[PDB]
Structure 1
Amino acid sequence: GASKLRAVLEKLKLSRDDISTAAGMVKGVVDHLLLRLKCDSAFRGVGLLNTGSYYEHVKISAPNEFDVMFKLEVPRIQLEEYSNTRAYYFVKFKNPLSQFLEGEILSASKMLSKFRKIIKEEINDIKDTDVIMKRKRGGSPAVTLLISEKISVDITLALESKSSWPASTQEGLRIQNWLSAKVRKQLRLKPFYLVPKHAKQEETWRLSFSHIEKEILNNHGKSKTCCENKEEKCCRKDCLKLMKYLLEQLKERFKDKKHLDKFSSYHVKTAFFHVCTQNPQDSQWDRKDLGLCFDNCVTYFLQCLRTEKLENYFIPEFNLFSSNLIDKRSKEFLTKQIEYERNNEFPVFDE
C-alpha cells in the first residue's frame, strides 16, 4: 500500500548525495573532454545536451553509471526513412561532414569510428579517465568513459536538426489534453536529434527526443504551477521513480541468467508518459493518491506486456515491444513477475 511505497521513496532518498557527488565528477570530465573537442577537432561544433535521468531528477540508483549526450549542429538535413521502420533514417544534406559522406548518405559507421578514435586520443591527456568499450548497441552509446576506474559514462553522439520533425511523428506526442495544444506546437518547433543506430549492415540513424522528455518531466502538470507550491504537489515523478525502481529490483533477482535483460528504464518511462496522456488532470495525480497512481502505472505497463505493444511516445508506429525486438517469452515472464508483485502489495519492496 501507499505507506510501503512512501517508505520506498524515503529509501531512494538515501542515495541522493552519492548520485549528485558522482554527477559532479562526471561533469568535470565531460566538460574537459568537450573543451578538447570544441577547440580543434572534427567535432568542433559539439555541445552538451543535458538530458537523461539525472537532469530529469529521476535517477534514483547506480551512482557509478551515467548516460551523456553530445549534440552536433549540422547544416540542413534531408531524411530518408529506412524501409517502413518509422524511427530509422538515412541522413542526406540539402559542409564540415563531407569526410563521412558516401555518395549522398552520411555514414554513421564512419562518423562513429572517427568519434571513438578522437575521444580515445583526447582522453590520454585527461586525468584518471580511460576509454572502455561496452556492447556496441547499434552505435549508441558511441563510446564509454571510465572515471577514476569507477564511474562508467556512456556518451552518445547526436546530430541536431533544426528542421520540422519527420512525418512519422505527426500523430505522436499526444499531450494536447494534458499539457495543451499550445505546448505541443511549442515543443515541435524545437530541434530533433539523430543518433547513429543499427536498425536490425546499414548507415541508419534513429530519432531522439531526449530533450523533450526532459522538458515534459520537469514541467509536467496541467497547471503551470504544478509542484511549485504545497497545494499542487503531485505524485507523477514519484510514480516514475517507483516504476524504475520496480524494474531495477526485479532485474536484480535474475543476475545469473539475466532473463529481464531486454527491458530498460526507457520502456518504463515510455509507459509512464502514456499514463500521463491517459490521466491528464493534476487531480488524477494527487500526492495523497500515490498508491492508486502507482497502480495505474503498473497496470498500464502490464497491458503493454500482454498486448506486446508499447508505442514510442513520439513515433506511434515504432513498437518498442514488438516480437522482433523482445521475444514473446520474455514479455510473458515479466508479466508473471509483475502480476504476482501487484497482487501481493509488492513484496519486492518489503524490508
Structure 2
Amino acid sequence: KLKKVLDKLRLKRKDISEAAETVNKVVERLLRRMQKRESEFKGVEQLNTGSYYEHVKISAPNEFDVMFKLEVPRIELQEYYETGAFYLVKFKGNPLSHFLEGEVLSATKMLSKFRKIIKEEVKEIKDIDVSVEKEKPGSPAVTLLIRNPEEISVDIILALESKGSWPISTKEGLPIQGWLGTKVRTNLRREPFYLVPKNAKDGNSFQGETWRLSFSHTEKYILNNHGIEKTCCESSGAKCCRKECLKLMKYLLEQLKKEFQELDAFCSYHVKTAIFHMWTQDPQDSQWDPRNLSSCFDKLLAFFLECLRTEKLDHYFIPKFNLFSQELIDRKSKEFLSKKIEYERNNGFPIFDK
C-alpha cells in the first residue's frame, strides 16, 4: 500500500523538465539583475535549497526554493531575547548603510529593497507568465507565481552569509556524532552560516529588524549524505527508505492541512525536523531497510505524536528553540493534529486515497 502511494507521489521526468527549464530561466534573469550594476546586492550567489533540490518534493514539481546569498564580512550578532534562532545584526561607505536603522542592519529595509528590485525585473519579463505574490508578513521570501501553464511557485530567499564560527545556540545542535560522525559534524560547522530576513514574532507583531538563522545548506547535504555507510543509496551500495519515509510523512500532513484550516500553523519543516531526530535515534542503515518501510513510517508517526503530546520539538540545529512551544502553536492545534494522525494511523490511512 505504502509502495503504491510512493509511486503516486513520485515526480514525472517530463513534468520536471518543463518546470525546471522555465524556473531556471527566470532565476538566472533575476540573478543577473541583482549583480548588475550599482546595486546593493551586487555580489549575491545562488544556492538552491528545499524539498525539490533535496529530492523529497512530492506529487508535482510546483515549488522551488532558491537563496540569493550575500557575503557580509565583520558582522556581530546579538541574540534577540533568548530565542536562539533570531538575531539583531550589527557591523564591526558600504552599499548596505542604506539599510541601517541606527547601527542595526534592518531585515525589513533590506528585504523591501530586494523585493522592489525583483518586482521591477519581473515586470520586464515578457516571454514568461510570472508575477510576484503578495507580501506575507514575517516571511523572508519573495515568492514568484509562474504559469507554465501549470502553477509553479518560486521562493527567492535573500540571505546574509557569515564565515565565522556558528552562534553558541547551535553548540549542542546537529547531534550526528553516532550517525554521520564527528568529522562530518566538524566539517559542516566549518562551513558558513546564513541569516534570512524572517522576523521574530513578538506578541501581536513582528520585530522588523530581526533576522533568522538558516542551515538550508547543511540540511541539503544531510539529505544527500544520510547513511551511516558511505555507500547508502549509491550505485554500489544498499538502498534505504529514509527519504521515502519522509515523503510519506510530508504527504500525510499535506493532505490533512488541505481539509483542515485548524492546521495552518503546521508545516513540512516540522516533519523534516522530526525525522532528523529519528535518523539520530535510529542511525543504522539496517533500521531503514526498504523491506521495513511500514515500521519505519510507524516509528516516525509515534515519535511525532509524542512530540505533539509533550509540546516539544527541538530545532535540530538550535535545541533550545522549541518548534512546538505554546508560544508558536496553540495546545488545541496540536491536540487536533494528534487526533487526526491517530485516526489515519489506526485506520490504514484512508486519506492516502485522496
Question: Which interval holds the TM-score relative to the shorter structure?
Answer: over 0.9
Matched, 1:238 2:244: yes
Picking from 303, 325, 328, the partner of 1:325 is 328
Q: Which residue of 1 aligns with 2:133?
A: 133
For residue 263 of structure 2, give the secondary structure of its aligned residue in structure 1.
Answer: coil
Q: 1:77 to 1:147 in 2, by over 3 A?
A: same
How far did 1:152 drift?
2.3
Q: How many residues align?
A: 344
1:165 aligned partner: 166
**Residue 275, structure 1, aligned to residue 278, structure 2:** yes
Output one character per residue of 1:82-127: Cα deviation in whole Å (capped at 9) or x when no partner.
1111110001112331111122210111101111111112222223
| Residues 173-228 of structure 1: per-residue CA shift (max 9 Å, x gap) | 00000000111000000111101122113400000000000000001000111111
What code does the residue aligned with 1:53 have? Answer: S
Distance 2:353 2:197 in 1: 41
Matched, 1:21 2:18: yes
Name 2:204's counterpart in structure 1: none
What residue number does 1:300 align with? Answer: 303
Change (3 A) 1:62 1:231: closer
One of 56, 66, 82 as aligned partner of 1:58: 56
Q: How does 1:22-171 map to 2 (within 5 A)?
A: 22-40=19-37, 41-94=39-92, 95-127=94-126, 128-141=128-141, 143-148=142-147, 150-171=151-172
CA distance in 2, matches of 1:273, 1:232: 20
Q: Tell me by how many angstroms 1:288 deviates.
A: 0.9
CA deviation profile, 1:16-49 (whole Å, cap 9, x unmatched): 5424531331111001110111121221111111
8 Å CA contact retained: 1:144, 1:153: yes
- Bigger shift: residues 121-130 or 31-40: 121-130
Whether contact under 8 Å (2:263, 2:333) holds in the other structure is yes
Fraction of identical pairs, as percent: 69
Residue pairs, 1:222-261, within 5 angstroms: 222-229=228-235, 232-254=238-260, 258-261=261-264
RMSD of the alignment, in Å?
1.7
Structure 2 letter corresponding to 1:80: Q
1:192–1:348 Cα change, 3 Å:
same
* Residue 216 (str. 1) matches residue 208 (str. 2): no
Q: Is the 8 A contact 1:19 1:61 kept in 2?
A: no
Distance 1:179 1:111 in 2: 37
Q: Aligned equivalents of 1:34 and 1:129: distance in 2? A: 18
- Residue 51 (structure 1) shift: 1.0
- Once residues 242 and 58 of structure 1 are traced to their aligned partners in structure 2, the CA distance between those partners, rounded to angstroms, is 10
Q: Look up the SS of the partner of 1:138 in the other structure.
A: coil
TM-score (norm 2): 0.93
Is the Cα contact below 8 Å between 1:46 and 1:70 reproduced in 2?
yes
SS state at 1:259 partner: helix
Instruction: Tell me how far apart the structure 1 counterparts of residues 156 and 60 of structure 2 sit (CA, whole Å).
Output: 16
Distance in 2, Cα, partners of 1:109 & 1:14:
36
Shift of 1:131: 3.8
